[PDB]
Design a protein around this ligand. Structure first.
Ligand SMILES: CC(=N)N1CC[C@H](Oc2ccc([C@H](Cc3ccc4ccc(C(=N)N)cc4c3)C(=O)O)cc2)C1
Ligand SMILES: [Ca+2]
Lengths: 235, 55
């Protein structure tokens, strides 16, 4: 995460890491329940097979707390158009339940109304992940979190050189060199309301990182909550 | 007169959904609604959205 702050003990308990075959974490995810992990559709291409690790706060040492789980079913949004990156969302159902503990906890899903309004009305959300700390730089090893302000739809459109659809939203800094980056795909953009943390979006894409003039964009979870409960029942 | 999930989210801890003229609060899965119809009480030891730290 470019220019973040560190996730201290227990501070970002919903952060999942998706590790490929050689344990390389290629993306992130948000814990939603004992079995379902939320992530962003394109990440499923960066490995033939992967596993999800929860409880991981530092990539380097095995300080306990870390727990890997195999994925059972991968439910991907069938409309993910790779060239727009529209409908970039997928639900992973794990084979063995995630045991909650310090640094292991689900984020809350909101409801479409009261999400649109209240959560997107808040001026700031939180994002985090084991992804590039500078663009043309190493990934992270320490879990970094960053406060990313909500950006209005029209400016978002005006800045991005690619069509932003109503399944996306922009959050980031215009000039302040701070932002999510490569390797945070699928990671949580959560918004805090009265100490409760609600998932509002997942890290999708963006023109580079912390780029002067552009913003980081996220998939708008508010447009998919029904699809999420579909797949959480299993459909 | 009374209304507005605006005012101050109608003092709901979590979801406010104004019905008729009443604020009407609700809670996320894992929270039980407290008898005062405003607060949400964690049902389980590790409710969603709460920071699992030395709290
Ligand atoms: C091909 C096409 N028509 N597109 C429409 C939009 C889509 O956006 C992308 C996707 C991947 C990259 C990656 C880089 C890339 C990949 C993931 C990112 C996640 C977050 C942020 C962020 N600034 N918050 C930046 C990222 C940049 C590349 O290797 O170039 C860059 C831009 C591409
Ligand atoms: Ca570790």
């Amino acid at each position: 995460i470019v220019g973040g702050q560190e996730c201290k003990d227990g501070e970002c308990p919903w952060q999942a890491l998706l590790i490929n075959e050689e344990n390389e974490g290629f993306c992130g995810g948000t814990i939603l329940s004992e079995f379902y992990i939320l992530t962003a559709a394109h990440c499923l291409y960066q490995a033939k097979r992967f596993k999800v690790r929860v409880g991981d706060r530092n990539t380097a040492a095995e300080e306990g707390g870390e727990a890997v789980h195999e994925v059972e079913v991968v439910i991907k949004h069938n409309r993910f158009t790779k060239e727009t990156y529209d409908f970039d969302i997928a639900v992973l159902r794990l084979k063995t339940p995630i045991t909650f503990r310090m640094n292991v906890a689900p984020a809350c899903l909101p409801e479409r109304d009261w999400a649109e309004s209240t959560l997107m009305t808040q001026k700031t959300g939180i994002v985090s992940g084991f992804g590039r700390t500078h663009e043309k730089g190493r990934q992270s090893t320490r879990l970094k979190m960053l406060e990313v302000p909500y950006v209005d739809r029209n400016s978002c459109k005006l800045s991005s050189s690619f069509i932003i659809t109503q399944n996306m939203f922009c959050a980031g800094y215009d000039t302040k060199q701070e932002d999510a980056c490569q390797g945070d795909s699928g990671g949580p953009h959560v918004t805090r309301f009265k100490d409760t943390y609600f998932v509002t979006g997942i890290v999708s894409w963006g023109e580079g990182c912390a780029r002067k003039g552009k913003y980081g964009i996220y998939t708008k979870v508010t447009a998919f909550l029904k699809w999420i409960d579909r797949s959480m029942k299993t459909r | 007169t009374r209304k507005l999930c605006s005012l101050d989210n109608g003092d709901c801890d979590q979801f406010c959904h104004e019905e008729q003229a009443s604020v009407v609060c609700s809670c996320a899965r894992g929270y039980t609604l407290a008898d005062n119809g405003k607060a949400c009480i964690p049902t389980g030891p590790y409710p969603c959205g709460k920071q699992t730290l030395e709290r």
